[PDB]
Amino acid sequence: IWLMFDPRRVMVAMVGFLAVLALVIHFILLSSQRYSWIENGTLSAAQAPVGAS
Amino acid sequence: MHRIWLMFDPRRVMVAMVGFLAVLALVIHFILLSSQRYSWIENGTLSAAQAPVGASA
Amino acid sequence: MHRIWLMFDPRRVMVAMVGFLAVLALVIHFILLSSQRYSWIENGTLSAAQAPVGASA
Amino acid sequence: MHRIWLMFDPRRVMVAMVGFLAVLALVIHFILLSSQRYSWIENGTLSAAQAPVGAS
Amino acid sequence: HRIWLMFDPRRVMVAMVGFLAVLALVIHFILLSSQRYSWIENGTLSAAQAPVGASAPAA
Amino acid sequence: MHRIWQGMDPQIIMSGLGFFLAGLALIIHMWAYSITGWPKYKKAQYNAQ
Amino acid sequence: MHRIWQGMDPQIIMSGLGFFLAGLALIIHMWAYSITGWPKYKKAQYNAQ
Amino acid sequence: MHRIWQGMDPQIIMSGLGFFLAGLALIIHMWAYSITGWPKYKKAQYNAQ
Amino acid sequence: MHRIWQGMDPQIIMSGLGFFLAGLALIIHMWAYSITGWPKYKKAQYNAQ
Amino acid sequence: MHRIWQGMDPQIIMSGLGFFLAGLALIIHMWAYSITGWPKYKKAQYNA
Amino acid sequence: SDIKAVPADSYNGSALIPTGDPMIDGVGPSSWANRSDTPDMTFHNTAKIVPMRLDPTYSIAKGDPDPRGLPVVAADKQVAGTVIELWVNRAEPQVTYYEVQLTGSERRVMLPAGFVQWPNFGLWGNDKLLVKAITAAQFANVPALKRDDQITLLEEDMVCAYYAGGHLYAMAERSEPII
Amino acid sequence: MQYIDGAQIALYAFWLFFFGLIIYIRREDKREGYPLESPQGPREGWPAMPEKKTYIHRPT
Amino acid sequence: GMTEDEARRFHGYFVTGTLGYIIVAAVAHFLAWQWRPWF
Amino acid sequence: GMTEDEARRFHGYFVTGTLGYIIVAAVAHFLAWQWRPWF
Amino acid sequence: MTEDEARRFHGYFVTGTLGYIIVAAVAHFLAWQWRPWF
Amino acid sequence: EDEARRFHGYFVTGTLGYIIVAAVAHFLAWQWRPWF
Amino acid sequence: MTEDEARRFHGYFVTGTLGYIIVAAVAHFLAWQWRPWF
Amino acid sequence: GMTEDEARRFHGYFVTGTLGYIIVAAVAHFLAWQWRPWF
Amino acid sequence: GGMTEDEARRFHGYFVTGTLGYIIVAAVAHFLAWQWRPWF
Amino acid sequence: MTEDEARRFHGYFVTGTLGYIIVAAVAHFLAWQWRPWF
Amino acid sequence: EARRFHGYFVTGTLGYIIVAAVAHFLAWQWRPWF
Amino acid sequence: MTEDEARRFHGYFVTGTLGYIIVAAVAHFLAWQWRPWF
Ligand code: BCL
Ligand code: BCL
Ligand code: BCL
Ligand code: BCL
Ligand SMILES: COC(C)(C)C/C=C/C(C)=C/C=C/C(C=O)=C/C=C/C(C)=C/C=C/C=C(C)/C=C/C=C(\C)CC/C=C(C)/C=C/C=C(\C)C(=O)O
Ligand SMILES: COC(C)(C)C/C=C/C(C)=C/C=C/C(C=O)=C/C=C/C(C)=C/C=C/C=C(C)/C=C/C=C(\C)CC/C=C(C)/C=C/C=C(\C)C(=O)O
Ligand SMILES: COC(C)(C)C/C=C/C(C)=C/C=C/C(C=O)=C/C=C/C(C)=C/C=C/C=C(C)/C=C/C=C(\C)CC/C=C(C)/C=C/C=C(\C)C(=O)O
Ligand SMILES: COC(C)(C)C/C=C/C(C)=C/C=C/C(C=O)=C/C=C/C(C)=C/C=C/C=C(C)/C=C/C=C(\C)CC/C=C(C)/C=C/C=C(\C)C(=O)O
Ligand SMILES: COC(C)(C)C/C=C/C(C)=C/C=C/C(C=O)=C/C=C/C(C)=C/C=C/C=C(C)/C=C/C=C(\C)CC/C=C(C)/C=C/C=C(\C)C(=O)O
Ligand SMILES: COC(C)(C)C/C=C/C(C)=C/C=C/C(C=O)=C/C=C/C(C)=C/C=C/C=C(C)/C=C/C=C(\C)CC/C=C(C)/C=C/C=C(\C)C(=O)O
Ligand SMILES: COC(C)(C)C/C=C/C(C)=C/C=C/C(C=O)=C/C=C/C(C)=C/C=C/C=C(C)/C=C/C=C(\C)CC/C=C(C)/C=C/C=C(\C)C(=O)O
Ligand SMILES: COC(C)(C)C/C=C/C(C)=C/C=C/C(C=O)=C/C=C/C(C)=C/C=C/C=C(C)/C=C/C=C(\C)CC/C=C(C)/C=C/C=C(\C)C(=O)O
Incomplete structure (x- = not known):
């Protein structure tokens, strides 16, 4: 081994x-926009940024 | 064959x-x-129908 | 720990x-x-409600 | 300790x-x-109420 | 001393x-x-005339 | 069944048990605080009055 | 039968079994949380007051 | 027909068969979830009651 | 039961414990301050004069 | 009970106790100043 | 204490002061490495550095002074001897050493070509060789060879180290601050 | 994605490659004169000194 | 590693814990079935 | 390291320590259920 | 460290733990009459 | 080999223990902000 | 460096390679259910 | 590797282990057919 | 290693009586502070 | 470095490491009350 | 011995931190950062 | 070198350090009267 x-x-x-x-x-x-947790970590899952369809 | x-x-x-x-x-x-379709960090929560598709010609 | x-x-x-x-x-x-939210030298005296937050979407 | x-x-x-x-x-x-709040050479003599604070 | x-x-x-x-x-x-302690130029000013730095007002 | 402990230091067994128990207990206390709403409701009682 | 364990380490077997059980129990608990919706519905009852 | 196993480590066959069955059951389960519509329909009842 | 302390420095155990206790008492005191709101309500009574 | 000090330097013990006592008394005096409002109300009386 | 040098004071990082005569004991800039005690060989298993008298196919290019029979002016501006034979590198054709016979003969010493300077940078009359590294007296203490026709790498280091160490030890003034 | 682009990815890949190369060259730099001598004992910086390297010479 | 006698003893204990884990898990699924039954 | 003789004695202490943790945690869950049931 | 001195140390440890736990119990009792947390 | 097998015990447990802790970390992140 | 050595290596090398391929097959099937590329 | 007796004893176990696996899978498919047939 | 068993016994005496005197003095300080500004 | 020295050192290293984590835990709890990041 | 240096290093270190703690007390009275 | 000269040197070093601190204190007090920074 x-x-x-x-x-x-x-x-x-x-x-x-x-x-x-x-x-x-x-x-x-x-x-990233969605997981910039230092700035936007207090947002809820519904409020988090999502990329365009 | 291992040789x-x-x-x-x-x-x-x-x-x-x-x-x-x-x-x-x-x-x-x-x-x-x-890519646009598979930028999963941003658009990973989109369903397959909402995911971007390249231009059709 | 042992070795x-x-x-x-x-x-x-x-x-x-x-x-x-x-x-x-x-x-x-x-x-x-x-960062904006944790620039404590300038805005450390703000409370949690008044601290900056990233834009929601 | 000392070792x-x-x-x-x-x-x-x-x-x-x-x-x-x-x-x-x-x-x-x-x-x-x-920093703006602690540039003591410049503001220095301002009271804690007059000192700059970052934007909310 | 050692x-x-x-x-x-x-x-x-x-x-x-x-x-x-x-x-x-x-x-x-x-x-x-510094502006307040640039003594070569403004050393003759009194403390009441010495520059004091401040931030911009809200409006 | 007691022969599993043969070979390893009993300190390592207990040292690795505290990490498990402390790590797990902190996850579930956070899990339980949100589920029950405590001390959110009691904290809001004393802040309001 | 029992001869499958021959030449092995009892600690390796228990290390990999615990890894199996811990990893699988995590997957199915999240599977079960989304199916039943348990913590969500009970959290809403307590965090609405 | 026991002559196939002659000369191969038994732990290798069992661990190589475990990889196959674990990965196959995972693929067919996800294959079966989309066909039967489970647990989509049951999750809809509890999460939209 | 007493043999756990075999081959261990009593100074190290008391240092490891009393410093576990110091950190936990600080965390729970801060936890208790925000729950009861004790310094807030009494400080506001003396800051209004 | 006394055997916990065995093998230890008495000056190190007294140095670490002075550190604890001085650092702890400095935190609580600041704690107590903001709770009681001690120097503020009397400073404002004389500096009027 | 096998290096014949003593620290100045008891503070670490301090410089060593040689105990005897650093030129011969090999200390500081006079130090040499313990190379192999065998001659260097060319591509065809022959001695790399040889005197010209062992290979008559080598000569001096036209327009280049023949330094044989020329005086060797040392750091004292006093002639320390006369060049009588050249040692050349056969792998790459180039003068490597000069053989100097002393004023009262009775011995021959080697002189690396790297410490040889020519008058007026070799532009005007080239009637002597300049050796700024060593004095005429210390030419007699240059280490000798075991054989008169080949030189090993061990002694090659010793001759070069001895000359290079004399930029700090030839005279007391060379080891002192200028101000 | 949006902030991450190809030039940045290539730059960081080059940075990782450069750091690995510097580690390799620093390992090669310690093939002579090592280990260091100190009053406290033998000393080696990072990266540690490599294995002894032997050359090959033509026969006589 | 383990010897044949050591493995015979290990396998019996490992089997004992396997059903004990499974029976206790069967009660967990029974309790969860009455609460919120799937399919 | 560890020997057979001290492994049974340690196992006895480990089992009673493990078991006591269970009833102690059992009361905590029972006390929490009367306060705020989670189902 | 040794077998015999870990028997007496454990006795000193247990009594110190109970005395610490009991005194903390009095603190929680006084805090509950002042501001109950449930 | 006695020394290799003893090291294998600690390495395998350490690798598996590390992965389980990472799995718990991804579970907590999924509750906070799922990426699918 | 011998014929016997290749026997022990091949079993673990084949099992490791097969395990890697199978887990990649599961990952590709998972990605297809999420967002198919054809 | 294995010997003649080792491969003969292993092969009998591997066949009843395989056969036992098919029976339990057959019941699962039979149970799933009554619940949600796929044809 | 400094402070042998006999030294540790004697030091423990002064250290214990030192703690008691410090705590008693702090008790008076808390008593005086409570009549001035009670914190509950 | 023998096995005897590797034990007395380990006790001081584990104790120092655990103390570093405890202070970091207090600092993280103190920062959470000031301005939580989730 | 290392015991002699330990006594001076510890007392010097703890003294330095206490003096720095007083400096932070003075700066807090002048301009708090929280 | 010798402890006799290690006592002579330390006396002048401390007095020189003390003298340097005092003149700096006087200088800082002079500057505070002219233009205070707090
Ligand atoms: C819509 C489809 C039907 C259904 C129809 C069937 C049918 C039909 C059959 C099964 C069969 C099985 N089903 Mg079913 N089954 C359903 C739902 C479930 C659920 C569930 C909670 O949703 C579970 C746990 C199971 C479980 C199982 C197994 C007991 C069995 C397959 C054994 C096997 O080979 O495993 C493979 C072996 C493994 C070890 C797989 C392990 C999988 C994990 C993910 C591996 C990685 C673990 C690792 C440690 C995790 C790491 C964590 C971090 C990511 C690092 N089914 C639904 C209701 N099921 C089959 C069987 O044999 O029945 C007797 C079968 O024929
Ligand atoms: C907005 C910021 C504030 C302010 C806030 C603070 C705070 C808060 C602190 C300082 C500290 C210091 N500040 Mg400042 N400071 C301000 C403006 C200044 C100005 C100026 C031109 O305006 C100056 C010159 C200084 C200078 C100094 C130093 C004297 C000191 C840091 C030295 C150090 O760490 O060395 C480190 C390097 C070394 C080599 C150490 C040298 C030896 C040190 C000085 C002492 C060693 C121990 C001593 C002998 C005691 C021994 C033990 C006994 C048992 C007691 N400050 C402004 C107004 N300053 C720090 C300090 O430690 O204060 C005491 C500190 O915590
Ligand atoms: C839009 C794209 C999809 C996605 C689609 C896929 C697909 C499809 C696959 C992966 C695969 C992998 N992905 Mg991806 N992946 C996504 C996002 C992520 C993110 C992230 C931050 O979001 C991470 C960390 C990963 C990470 C990973 C790795 C676990 C794995 C590649 C291993 C490797 O290096 O092999 C190369 C390594 C080597 C050549 C040397 C090292 C070999 C060792 C043995 C690798 C161990 C990993 C794992 C345990 C393998 C099993 C080994 C056996 C047990 C022996 N993915 C997104 C959501 N990803 C591949 C894979 O193999 O998955 C299992 C794969 O097929
Ligand atoms: C928005 C961010 C927050 C903030 C949030 C945090 C958080 C959260 C943490 C810190 C931590 C630290 N912060 Mg910060 N902090 C802020 C502002 C500051 C400012 C400032 C000028 O404003 C300063 C100077 C500091 C300074 C520091 C350090 C004291 C420390 C990291 C040191 C470290 O790990 O070194 C590297 C380590 C070393 C060089 C080794 C040190 C070894 C020590 C000295 C000895 C340990 C062993 C010893 C034997 C223990 C004995 C005790 C018993 C055994 C128990 N913070 C702002 C307001 N800070 C971190 C920390 O680690 O705290 C402990 C931490 O977790
Ligand atoms: C999202 O939905 C998806 C995921 C898609 C759905 C799909 C899900 C699937 C497919 C799930 C598969 C599940 C599964 C099967 O495949 C799960 C298999 C589970 C199993 C097998 C569990 C077995 C547990 C065994 C235990 C606990 C035994 C413990 C034994 C102990 C304690 C004794 C130890 C021995 C000792 C002490 C003796 C020492 C002697 C010594 C040392 C000596 O003698 O030397
Ligand atoms: C929220 O969402 C998600 C997270 C998804 C939800 C899911 C959660 C899940 C899946 C949780 C799983 C939990 C779990 C798994 O079973 C939890 C398992 C817990 C267990 C087993 C706990 C056991 C504790 C045992 C203890 C404390 C025993 C201590 C023993 C002591 C004190 C005595 C020691 C005596 C000694 C040393 C004497 C030495 C003698 C010597 C040396 C001598 O005599 O010589
Ligand atoms: C935000 O929510 C949050 C708040 C996080 C939710 C919280 C959740 C959780 C899970 C909290 C956990 C709490 C906990 C864990 O169990 C708490 C556990 C606490 C424990 C066990 C405390 C134990 C204390 C023990 C003491 C004081 C012992 C002192 C002993 C002394 C004094 C004697 C010393 C011996 C000597 C002198 C011998 C000398 C002689 C010698 C040497 C000789 O004679 O040789
Ligand atoms: C943008 O998204 C992008 C990024 C692009 C997406 C892409 C992602 C990709 C490609 C990811 C790849 C992931 C990957 C695989 O390649 C990841 C692989 C992970 C792995 C395998 C981790 C394994 C970790 C193992 C650890 C930590 C083990 C620690 C061991 C310990 C602690 C024990 C040591 C103790 C000792 C020695 C003392 C005992 C010895 C004793 C007593 C003795 O010897 O005697
Ligand atoms: C950018 O891509 C665009 C352009 C979009 C398109 C792409 C196009 C292309 C060209 C794709 C190419 C794909 C490809 C081929 O080229 C892909 C090739 C893949 C392959 C082959 C993968 C194989 C992996 C095998 C692994 C991981 C094996 C691990 C083995 C292990 C773990 C065993 C360890 C054993 C041990 C330790 C025991 C030692 C025993 C010993 C020592 C003993 O016995 O002594
Ligand atoms: C999207 O859908 C798509 C994917 C397109 C559709 C899919 C289509 C296809 C084609 C699927 C393929 C299915 C398939 C392949 O043909 C499926 C093949 C399945 C098979 C073969 C299963 C075999 C299982 C065997 C088992 C469980 C054996 C266990 C043995 C045990 C427990 C005994 C162990 C103990 C022993 C031995 C004792 C040691 C003694 C020793 C050592 C001694 O004594 O020496
Ligand atoms: C913001 O609010 C937050 C902060 C959150 C709220 C706070 C919460 C908490 C948890 C606070 C913690 C409080 C606490 C913890 O227990 C407080 C603990 C206090 C303690 C124990 C104090 C002890 C003092 C002891 C003293 C003074 C002893 C002096 C001894 C003397 C003088 C004798 C000297 C020795 C001699 C002479 C012998 C010479 C040697 C000889 C002869 C020899 O060797 O021969
Ligand atoms: C915004 O502004 C920024 C800048 C950013 C903020 C600033 C920040 C910082 C970090 C400030 C730092 C401050 C600092 C650090 O600690 C300050 C520390 C200062 C110190 C220690 C000063 C000490 C001076 C000592 C002196 C002068 C001693 C003189 C001794 C003399 C003259 C005697 C010599 C003659 C002798 C001995 C003859 C005897 C010989 C004899 C007998 C013989 O030969 O025998």
């Missing part, structure tokens, strides 16, 4: 990958 | 395919996010 | 985590300061 | 701590100077 | 003097930039 990949390298690579992905998703939502 | 792993190194190959799969997945997700 | 400090140097983890938390705290603080 | 100094030498930690505190203090003082 | 065993007094003196000179110059330069 963990004899071909050196778990130490994998954990540091995996933590870095998860941290980068989490920041990317959080920032993409923050740039 | 293919004696011709290509399993460690190198599986790292390459994990990297290639991740790049492909990100490319497809980002192409859909840039 | 996490034996395989990872605690001094390297101590410095890495301290530096990461400092950068993250500054990033969150600067994001809030740049 | 953190058997892991981090007191001299290096003190220099980094002093450097971080000085940069933080200057950043906060300069952030307040750039 | 701080001089762990640090060279010669080098601490130079670092301290350099830091104080930079800080003093920065504060004097910031005040020279």
